[PDB]
Amino acid sequence: GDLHLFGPNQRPAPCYDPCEAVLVESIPEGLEFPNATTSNPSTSQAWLGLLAGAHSSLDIASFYWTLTNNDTHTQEPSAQQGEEVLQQLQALAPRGVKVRIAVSKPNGPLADLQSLLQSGAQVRMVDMQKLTHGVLHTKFWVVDQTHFYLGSANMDWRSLTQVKELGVVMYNCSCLARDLTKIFEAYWFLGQAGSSIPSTWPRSFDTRYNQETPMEICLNGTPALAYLASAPPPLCPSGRTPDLKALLNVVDSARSFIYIAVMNYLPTMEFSHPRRFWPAIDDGLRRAAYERGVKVRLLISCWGHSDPSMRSFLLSLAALHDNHTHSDIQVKLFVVPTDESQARIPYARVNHNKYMVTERASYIGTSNWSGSYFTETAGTSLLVTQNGHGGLRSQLEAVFLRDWESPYSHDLDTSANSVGNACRLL
Amino acid sequence: GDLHLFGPNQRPAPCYDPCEAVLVESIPEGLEFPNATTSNPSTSQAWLGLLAGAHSSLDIASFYWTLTNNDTHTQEPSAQQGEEVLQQLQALAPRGVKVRIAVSKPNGPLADLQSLLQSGAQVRMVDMQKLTHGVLHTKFWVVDQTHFYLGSANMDWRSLTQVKELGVVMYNCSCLARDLTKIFEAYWFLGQAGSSIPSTWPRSFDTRYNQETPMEICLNGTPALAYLASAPPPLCPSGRTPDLKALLNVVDSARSFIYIAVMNYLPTMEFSHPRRFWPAIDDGLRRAAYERGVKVRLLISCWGHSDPSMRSFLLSLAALHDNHTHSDIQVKLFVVPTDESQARIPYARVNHNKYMVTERASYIGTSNWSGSYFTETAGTSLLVTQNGHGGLRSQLEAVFLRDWESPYSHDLDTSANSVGNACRLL
Ligand SMILES: *[C@@H]1O[C@H](CO)[C@@H](O[C@@H]2O[C@H](CO)[C@@H](O[C@@H]3O[C@H](CO[C@H]4O[C@H](CO[C@H]5O[C@H](CO)[C@@H](O)[C@H](O)[C@@H]5O)[C@@H](O)[C@H](O[C@H]5O[C@H](CO)[C@@H](O)[C@H](O)[C@@H]5O)[C@@H]4O)[C@@H](O)[C@H](O[C@H]4O[C@H](CO)[C@@H](O)[C@H](O)[C@@H]4O)[C@@H]3O)[C@H](O)[C@H]2NC(C)=O)[C@H](O)[C@H]1NC(C)=O
Ligand SMILES: *[C@@H]1O[C@H](CO)[C@@H](O[C@@H]2O[C@H](CO)[C@@H](O[C@@H]3O[C@H](CO[C@H]4O[C@H](CO[C@H]5O[C@H](CO)[C@@H](O)[C@H](O)[C@@H]5O)[C@@H](O)[C@H](O[C@H]5O[C@H](CO)[C@@H](O)[C@H](O)[C@@H]5O)[C@@H]4O)[C@@H](O)[C@H](O[C@H]4O[C@H](CO)[C@@H](O)[C@H](O)[C@@H]4O)[C@@H]3O)[C@H](O)[C@H]2NC(C)=O)[C@H](O)[C@H]1NC(C)=O
Ligand SMILES: *[C@@H]1O[C@H](CO)[C@@H](O[C@@H]2O[C@H](CO)[C@@H](O[C@@H]3O[C@H](CO)[C@@H](O)[C@H](O)[C@@H]3O)[C@H](O)[C@H]2NC(C)=O)[C@H](O)[C@H]1NC(C)=O
Ligand SMILES: *[C@@H]1O[C@H](CO)[C@@H](O[C@@H]2O[C@H](CO)[C@@H](O[C@@H]3O[C@H](CO)[C@@H](O)[C@H](O)[C@@H]3O)[C@H](O)[C@H]2NC(C)=O)[C@H](O)[C@H]1NC(C)=O
Numbered sequence: 001g002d003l004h005l006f007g008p009n010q011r012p013a014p015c016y017d018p019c020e021a022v023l024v025e026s027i028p029e030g031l032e033f034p035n036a037t038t039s040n041p042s043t044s045q046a047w048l049g050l051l052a053g054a055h056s057s058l059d060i061a062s063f064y065w066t067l068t069n070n071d072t073h074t075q076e077p078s079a080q081q082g083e084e085v086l087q088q089l090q091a092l093a094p095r096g097v098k099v100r101i102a103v104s105k106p107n108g109p110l111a112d113l114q115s116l117l118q119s120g121a122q123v124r125m126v127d128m129q130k131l132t133h134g135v136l137h138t139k140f141w142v143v144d145q146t147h148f149y150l151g152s153a154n155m156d157w158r159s160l161t162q163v164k165e166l167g168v169v170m171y172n173c174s175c176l177a178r179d180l181t182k183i184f185e186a187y188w189f190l191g192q193a194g195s196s197i198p199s200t201w202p203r204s205f206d207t208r209y210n211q212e213t214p215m216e217i218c219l220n221g222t223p224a225l226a227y228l229a230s231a232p233p234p235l236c237p238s239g240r241t242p243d244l245k246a247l248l249n250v251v252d253s254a255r256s257f258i259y260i261a262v263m264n265y266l267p268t269m270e271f272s273h274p275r276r277f278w279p280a281i282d283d284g285l286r287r288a289a290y291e292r293g294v295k296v297r298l299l300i301s302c303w304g305h306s307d308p309s310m311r312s313f314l315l316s317l318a319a320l321h322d323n324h325t326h327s328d329i330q331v332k333l334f335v336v337p338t339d340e341s342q343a344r345i346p347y348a349r350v351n352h353n354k355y356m357v358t359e360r361a362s363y364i365g366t367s368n369w370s371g372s373y374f375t376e377t378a379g380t381s382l383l384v385t386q387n388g389h390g391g392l393r394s395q396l397e398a399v400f401l402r403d404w405e406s407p408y409s410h411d412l413d414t415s416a417n418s419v420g421n422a423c424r425l426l
Numbered sequence: 427g428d429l430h431l432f433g434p435n436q437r438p439a440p441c442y443d444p445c446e447a448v449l450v451e452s453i454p455e456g457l458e459f460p461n462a463t464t465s466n467p468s469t470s471q472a473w474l475g476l477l478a479g480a481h482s483s484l485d486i487a488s489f490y491w492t493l494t495n496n497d498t499h500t501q502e503p504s505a506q507q508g509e510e511v512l513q514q515l516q517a518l519a520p521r522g523v524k525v526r527i528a529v530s531k532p533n534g535p536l537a538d539l540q541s542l543l544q545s546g547a548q549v550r551m552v553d554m555q556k557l558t559h560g561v562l563h564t565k566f567w568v569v570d571q572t573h574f575y576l577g578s579a580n581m582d583w584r585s586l587t588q589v590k591e592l593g594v595v596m597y598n599c600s601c602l603a604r605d606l607t608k609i610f611e612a613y614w615f616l617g618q619a620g621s622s623i624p625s626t627w628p629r630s631f632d633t634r635y636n637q638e639t640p641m642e643i644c645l646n647g648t649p650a651l652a653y654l655a656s657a658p659p660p661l662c663p664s665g666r667t668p669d670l671k672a673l674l675n676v677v678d679s680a681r682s683f684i685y686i687a688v689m690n691y692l693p694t695m696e697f698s699h700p701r702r703f704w705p706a707i708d709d710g711l712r713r714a715a716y717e718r719g720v721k722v723r724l725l726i727s728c729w730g731h732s733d734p735s736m737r738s739f740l741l742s743l744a745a746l747h748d749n750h751t752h753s754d755i756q757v758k759l760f761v762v763p764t765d766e767s768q769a770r771i772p773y774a775r776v777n778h779n780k781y782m783v784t785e786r787a788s789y790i791g792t793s794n795w796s797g798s799y800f801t802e803t804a805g806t807s808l809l810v811t812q813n814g815h816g817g818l819r820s821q822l823e824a825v826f827l828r829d830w831e832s833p834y835s836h837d838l839d840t841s842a843n844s845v846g847n848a849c850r851l852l
């Protein structure tokens with residue numbers, strides 16, 4: 001944008017930091033992938049490295065904190081890592097790292113946050129129920145205004161060893177890190193006593209990097225376009241792309257395929273006691289498949305707490321796979337096998353990833369794909385497009401294909417006894 | 427509306443004519459209904475009565491004209507009635523009835539219209555392809571600015587004896603007849619040479635009777651609210667409700683059930699070589715069923731010319747019938763059995779009705795339920811609401827239930843050999 005080649009459409013300044021993105025996964029204890037020719041760093045080790053390198057600041061947006069066995073009233077070896085994480089966190093403030101933690105208003109005092117407060121970290125509880133009827137569901141870390149983690153892993157030891165998670169760590173990308181810090185600051189401001197959402201956020205929260213003018217970055221030595229989308233709409237300044245709009249733009253721009261892996265997919269306002277039908281994403285997928293022959297693959301997690309009403313809706317989508325329409329939509333259920341010893345571990349053994357990948361773009365989110373997460377509840381997503389054929393997009397596609405062809409993915413007609421865990425959708 | 431009880435919302439003048447509505451059906455030769463405790467007058471006899479009583483004027487909006495065996499290159503007794511109809515039509519102008527006939531631009535000279543032109547009737551061909559990319563699909567009669575027929579029957583002898591049709595004749599309702607004449611006049615104006623759709627139609631085309639302020643009429647001695655909706659949008663003045671909006675208002679207002687019988691149902695722009703997904707009606711039905719527990723019954727016709735791609739979409743809707751959601755959507759295929767002697771009759775033996783009925787309202791249309799009919803192609807619908815529990819609404823519900831429970835309606839898993847006719851959807 002030069003004001004003479006494009007007029008008032010000034011393209012914002014490019015970023016010259018040597019950004020590098022790493023996919024990070026939590027693979028629960030017991031899951032093996034025969035082929036998986038490559039593996040990604042675990043969430044635990046990425047988090048520990050970030051904490052070890054931290055020297056100035058750490059901001060965490062979080063849903064809940066259960067990093068210790070005491071938190072879950074259990075006694076499991078596999079909890080170590082969360083505890084280790086907690087330990088390292090408590091070492092940040094004493095050595096001079098400014099720590100700020102925004103957490104959804106809990107239903108009672110939390111041990112980890114009290115210990116971190118005693119260590120010198122700042123903690124604020126955000127009551128999103130009173131503001132938007134949603135919750136602070138976002139999970140991300142910003143380190144030294146230079147690195148950040150965005151993904152599905154909660155501040156939960158299970159998230160490291162007993163729950164499958166996917167996310168991304170962006171290193172040496174200070175521009176994007178500061179951009180994410182703007183969202184964090186929205187949370188931080190709302191975490192005070194008596195604060196309300198402004199009708200128009202101050203300019204310090206606004207951003208020039210969005211769907212229309214994404215940030216130009218050097219990702220792994222190659223040019224790429226990236227931006228961060230936010231939810232809910234009342235928390236988005238005018239320049240910040242809403243999460244739903246970013247997701248649907250990725251869906252509508254796909255010309256070859258759309259692979260989606262999300263723990264829950266529901267074309268409804270799950271909540272809102274007067275229930276509401278919510279076909280935004282569903283209609284986007286139907287549109288892609290019908291109009292542009294896009295092959296749609298939907299990998300939905302299933303465990304004992306899954307909403308059974310999901311099944312019908314998924315079946316509805318699956319019904320569009322037809323010879324005459326040339327529409328190609330397939331649905332599979334990803335189940336995490338459980339042992340009798342793992343069955344005592346409360347609320348674990350489920351695939352928690354929330355991401356989508358096409359032939360042109362990558363979308364990594366914190367939200368499940370139901371209406372509330374995009375209208376009332378807090379969430380963030382990273383969107384990256386890179387003109388090459390390798391890169392982070394290819395890594396995401398490989399992860400999805402590995403999970404899709406793995407024996408843990410089953411069709412909707414599969415028997416409930418052949419999946420290795422409780423599945424209300426089968 | 428009194429300007430002091432409701433402000434600028436002035437309710438238009440009520441109609442004091444003794445309006446009486448009669449459901450009229452074409453039941454093809456060979457279809458019998460064991461119970462059907464009541465029967466409706468045939469389309470042929472209603473049309474013949476209207477022609478016999480006509481003394482001042484007749485306006486016909488039409489799609490095509492094949493009223494004679496010569497037109498279809500056949501020799502069938504069951505054609506008589508169309509021919510009889512044609513005969514009576516030719517008697518109108520010689521005895522002083524002003525006849526105006528608007529017809530979609532045909533692909534060659536039409537015999538019936540040439541004969542009627544020689545009889546003294548005015549005929550105009552409307553080229554909707556050049557104006558909106560659609561066709562003049564509307565079928566209705568206005569008689570003496572007092573009566574009118576609105577329904578699915580074309581100016582085709584088959585429509586009387588070999589194709590199932592549903593429609594309504596409104597007698598002694600001059601207010602509504604003149605209102606319909608306004609739509610006809612839109613067609614008549616566009617039927618000239620070199621005319622184009624005005625950006626704003628002159629006031630003579632506008633109407634005060636619409637969804638917001640329906641006409642108050644005395645229907646069969648009881649108060650009722652009625653209005654006429656029109657398609658496509660470019661042909662609607664500001665006061666005229668578009669057909670799609672009227673249909674969707676009936677769908678969204680239903681609290682108990684929605685019964686729909688339409689020859690074709692497709693959530694797509696069937697046409698528009700770059701194909702388009704079109705979920706307006708589909709989403710409305712999903713919304714009704716999910717949010718308000720409305721029981722949805724979809725009776726779709728199936729014959730040798732049916733679009734096979736319908737099946738998948740219907741199955742998609744049918745997939746929402748689930749115990750957990752409490753959603754109740756059912757789909758059946760209505761097939762007209764054919765004989766070897768009827769098989770020579772070209773383009774016949776199919777259910778042609780286009781109507782919807784709820785527990786509160788009646789909708790009778792000229793259009794199949796696909797996108798083009800509501801965006802580019804000409805169509806009209808009559809909407810009636812009556813606070814009582816009998817009336818025209820109950821008659822429509824009885825007709826639908828008769829057709830639904832009849833042996834001619836089959837589920838989507840039925841074998842193609844058990845329906846009595848070619849069915850591409852089975
Ligand atoms: C953009 O740039 C960034 C930055 O340059 C780049 O990020 C790198 O991405 C690559 C590819 O994904 C990463 O390399 C992979 O790392 C995987 C994880 O390695 C870590 O974890 C290993 C597992 O440790 C646990 O389990 C073992 C079990 O045996 C146990 O002992 C441990 O205690 C622990 O519990 C760990 O072994 C590993 O440490 C070894 O490897 C590192 C290499 O970084 C080395 O420095 C160490 O000294 C040590 O030797 C590390 O801690 C890893 O699994 C994976 O291995 C795959 O390939 C091999 C070879 O074929 C297979 O045999 C194997 O089965 C796996 O399939 C691979 O090495 C790399 O770590 C990232 N770098 C950073 C800083 O994160 C992006 O990829 C770039 N993007 C693009 C598009 O190019
Ligand atoms: C609002 O007001 C309007 C106006 O008042 C009102 O409209 C009336 O609605 C009623 C109910 O729908 C109509 O009455 C029905 O009419 C049916 C059709 O009747 C016509 O067609 C008959 C069939 O003729 C063909 O087939 C026979 C086969 O045997 C053949 O001979 C013929 O040649 C032809 O091919 C025909 O027989 C009939 O003529 C008889 O009946 C009329 C009555 O109008 C009488 O005047 C004649 O002299 C002659 O006797 C007529 O031409 C009819 O099928 C139906 O019958 C049902 O009920 C009987 C009794 O139970 C059953 O035995 C039978 O099997 C059927 O189930 C019934 O009679 C009436 O015609 C409408 N009036 C007008 C002017 O259209 C609305 O209903 C009102 N709305 C509300 C909500 O109240
Ligand atoms: C979970 O809760 C239990 C029970 O409250 C905690 O147990 C505590 O564990 C610590 C060490 O893990 C014990 O402290 C130890 O004291 C000895 C005394 O000499 C000292 O030498 C050691 O170096 C260590 O500091 C502590 O006594 C013990 N408390 C009880 C009541 O048994 C446990 O620490 C909690 N875990 C987490 C992660 O919070
Ligand atoms: C369909 O096409 C055929 C062939 O063109 C038409 O046949 C015509 O039928 C009419 C009567 O139905 C015949 O007219 C008759 O002429 C005698 C002559 O004395 C007269 O006495 C009768 O009263 C009657 O008017 C006409 O000759 C005949 N033409 C041919 C070539 O056989 C038929 O009329 C067409 N049907 C329709 C509905 O248009």
Ligand SMILES: *[C@@H]1O[C@H](CO)[C@@H](O[C@@H]2O[C@H](CO)[C@@H](O)[C@H](O)[C@H]2NC(C)=O)[C@H](O)[C@H]1NC(C)=O
Binds near residue numbers: 020171172
């Ligand atoms: C991010 O930036 C740091 C600092 O420049 C990089 O750390 C260097 O890494 C190379 C290769 O591993 C070493 O040879 C240098 O000695 C490191 N420098 C310092 C100051 O530590 C780091 O590699 C970059 N990328 C990531 C993913 O951290």
Ligand SMILES: *[C@@H]1O[C@H](CO)[C@@H](O[C@@H]2O[C@H](CO)[C@@H](O)[C@H](O)[C@H]2NC(C)=O)[C@H](O)[C@H]1NC(C)=O
Binds near residue numbers: 446597598
């Ligand atoms: C519509 O109006 C006409 C004219 O008022 C009605 O015709 C009358 O019908 C009654 C009962 O059938 C007869 O007793 C009268 O002699 C008729 N009058 C005339 C002038 O014909 C007619 O019934 C009304 N309804 C319909 C459906 O036509």
